[PDB]
Design a protein around this ligand. Sequence first.
Ligand SMILES: NC(=O)[C@@H]1CCCC[C@@H]1Nc1ncnc2ccsc12
Length: 167
Amino acid sequence: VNSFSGYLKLTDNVYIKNADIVEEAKKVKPTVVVNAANVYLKHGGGVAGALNKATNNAMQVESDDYIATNGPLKVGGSCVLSGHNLAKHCLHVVGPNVNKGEDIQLLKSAYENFNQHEVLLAPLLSAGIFGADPIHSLRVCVDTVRTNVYLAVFDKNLYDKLVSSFL
Ligand SMILES: NC(=O)[C@@H]1CCCC[C@@H]1Nc1ncnc2ccsc12
């Protein structure tokens, strides 16, 4: 039993809700919140900009030190950093950004990072400003993640479409 509330159960392990991941994180304080990161951990917009703003820029400060030490992530890769005031940990995961021409096949690799964590609050990878089809992102999620994932979909219109079209 966990503290997530109001989710629709899609499969054995995947749950979905129309919710603002920032507000969902502030309420639940999950062990792991997933950020829709880029390889530079520059949290400018989309989910990443929103998560970082909620930390008063502390996420960005920590991220800049991480990059200065380790260099950029790989597309499809991840790193674990602090969750600040939102969660115990933040798993920064880089899905392919279609508006940069990156290989959508890397979306499965990105979701594989979730399997290293028993329970996660997450957005749909590569959705929003990363330009991929969110229906496809949900499909890859369901077919790749085996751990318990609670998906927050900000746009109510998109949420209804994802549910109604889910196979
Ligand atoms: N979840 C959604 O409806 C959007 C479409 C799917 C993928 C990305 C995007 N997610 C976001 N979630 C929370 N806050 C924000 C702020 C700006 S984008 C965003």
